[PDB]
């Protein structure tokens, strides 16, 4: 198979104003070589909207500071532990959307792609 095993929640429901960890882990037979490992996290508002990069790994983590997230994105994983999760602090309704994580771990031939649909819930729903 060409697809790397990548584990993410297909739907992730978080409370408005909370800190949301977007979990993403992967499997590979090979040690993660920081000189070759690559990661690309993107965000898409809608299916017919562009896909905007917000974090990459090229030798080290690069936070692109995508303006719609202010300074609320942080890396929340450790590539050497096969974990490429991200954290979105202080979630706002506009953070709802599709988050994609693309992974390559040379010399593994398998290519990774996880997709999370993030939904933002009321902080105080009727109860």
Curated annotation (Swiss-Prot):
GO terms for cellular component: axon initial segment; node of Ranvier; plasma membrane; synapse; T-tubule; voltage-gated sodium channel complex. It comes from Homo sapiens. GO terms for molecular function: sodium channel regulator activity; voltage-gated potassium channel activity involved in ventricular cardiac muscle cell action potential repolarization; voltage-gated sodium channel activity involved in cardiac muscle cell action potential. GO terms for biological process: cardiac conduction; cardiac muscle cell action potential involved in contraction; cardiac muscle contraction; chemical synaptic transmission; gene expression; membrane depolarization during action potential; membrane depolarization during cardiac muscle cell action potential; nervous system development. Residues 4-127 are extracellular. Glycans are attached at residues 16, 40, 48. It comes from the Eukaryota. A voltage-gated sodium (Nav) channel consists of an ion-conducting pore-forming alpha subunit functional on its own that is regulated by one or more beta subunits. The beta subunit SCN2B is disulfide-linked to the pore-forming alpha subunit. Interacts with SCN1A; regulatory subunit of SCN1A/Nav1.1. Interacts with SCN2A; regulatory subunit of SCN2A/Nav1.2. Interacts with SCN3A; regulatory subunit of SCN3A/Nav1.3. Interacts with SCN5A; regulatory subunit of SCN5A/Nav1.5. Interacts with SCN8A; regulatory subunit of SCN8A/Nav1.6. Interacts with SCN9A; regulatory subunit of SCN9A/Nav1.7. Belongs to the sodium channel auxiliary subunit SCN2B (TC 8.A.17) family. Regulatory subunit of multiple voltage-gated sodium (Nav) channels directly mediating the depolarization of excitable membranes. Navs, also called VGSCs (voltage-gated sodium channels) or VDSCs (voltage-dependent sodium channels), operate by switching between closed and open conformations depending on the voltage difference across the membrane. In the open conformation they allow Na(+) ions to selectively pass through the pore, along their electrochemical gradient. The chain holds residues 30 to 153 of 215 of the full protein. Its main location: membrane. The record marks 30, 109 as: Binds SCN2A. This is Sodium channel regulatory subunit beta-2. Keywords: Atrial fibrillation, Brugada syndrome, Cell membrane, Cell projection, Disease variant, Disulfide bond, Glycoprotein, Immunoglobulin domain, Ion transport, Membrane, Phosphoprotein, Signal, Sodium, Sodium transport, Transmembrane, Transmembrane helix, Transport. Disulfide bonds join 24-101, 46-49. It is linked to Atrial fibrillation, familial, 14: A familial form of atrial fibrillation, a common sustained cardiac rhythm disturbance. Atrial fibrillation is characterized by disorganized atrial electrical activity and ineffective atrial contraction promoting blood stasis in the atria and reduces ventricular filling. It can result in palpitations, syncope, thromboembolic stroke, and congestive heart failure. It is found in: Cell membrane; Cell projection, Axon. It is a single-pass type I membrane protein.
